[PDB]
Design a binder for this molecule. Structure first.
Ligand code: HEM
Ligand code: HEM
Ligand SMILES: [Ca+2]
Lengths: 150, 146
């Protein structure tokens, strides 16, 4: 089923603010179930034709998986060089710099929020990490309270 | 609290990320009585001096009547401005947005006095709207629970 419309609008707004404020080329959020299964995927920075070419949606594998087992921020300067990296699928844009955080309320996990390819070729900053943590915390509030509502 | 802690956390994110001196959120019922008023940036002694809680008048009243973002270089210069009560800190720059869901608006999240005298930006407005939207879902759920 589709996400609740208020939740969807809120999460897209959060992904947009995060992407815009950290000057990332790409931004995404996975919304999960209680067993960390991806239920919804919202993103920005990739055109419709490229989305069609890629075809299958992400399973939340690789480095994204680390945000769950180690629920703290992860910054990398060459994401697909990490040993946990599963690699990009055919037609997916290549990406290098990465900033990811879990979306949580207290210890409860609701998904992941991540950004790639800071526009200046630079690594994501400490300030970028703090901003993205705060926005992920808001996303957690949104998911937790939409769920309860539904 | 539950809700109150949530709203305080959202006010803290808005105020700290935009780098404003003061931040607040008012949540009202359908007859505009204040149900929650949470804020940061003002010391307890000054709070005691102001005395009474805001009623949601002036520029905040405007935001309740017509819920859409309002950014001002000088809040006291707006035609709807009612002025501050005695002992309230002086405040100049202003950004306020509604706390809502599609069905209903519940409150207003607002910031004043961005650091270094600067006006709030379009980026600040967009960020505060995203934070407000999360608070809007929390308020909507609290009204089901209550
Ligand atoms: C636009 C924002 C996006 C960002 C920031 C992003 C980021 C990433 C990153 C960093 C990886 C590699 C993880 C690793 O190697 O461990 C990855 C993999 C992957 N991406 Fe994306 N991606 C985006 C959009 C998309 C879209 C729109 C699709 C599908 C239409 C997609 C499908 C996939 C798939 C299938 C994988 C393989 C791993 C998995 O299934 O989880 N991505 N993505
Ligand atoms: C620290 C965060 C705060 C912010 C950002 C803030 C901001 C404002 C603003 C923008 C106005 C509008 C004045 C106008 O229309 O010209 C106002 C008025 C007012 N404020 Fe505050 N304020 C804060 C804290 C407080 C506190 C702690 C109190 C008392 C406990 C208070 C009591 C009032 C009252 C009584 C008014 C008159 C209008 C009304 O009743 O709504 N304020 N404030
Ligand atoms: Ca550092």
């Amino acid at each position: 089923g589709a996400m609740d419309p208020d939740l969807e609008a809120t999460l897209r707004a959060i992904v947009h603010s995060a992407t815009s404020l950290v000057d990332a080329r790409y931004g995404a959020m996975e919304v999960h179930d209680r067993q960390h299964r991806v239920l919804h995927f919202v993103y920005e920075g990739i055109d419709e034709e490229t989305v069609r070419r890629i075809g299958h949606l992400p399973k939340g594998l690789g480095v994204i998986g680390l945000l769950i087992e180690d629920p703290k921020p992860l910054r990398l300067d060459d994401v697909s060089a990490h040993p946990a990296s599963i690699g990009f699928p055919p037609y997916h844009p290549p990406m290098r710099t990465f900033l990811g955080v879990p979306v949580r309320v207290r210890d409860e996990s609701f998904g992941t929020l991540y950004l790639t390819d800071k526009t200046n070729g630079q690594p994501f900053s400490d300030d970028d990490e703090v901003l993205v943590q705060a926005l992920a915390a808001a996303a957690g509030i949104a998911v937790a309270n939409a769920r309860l509502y539904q």
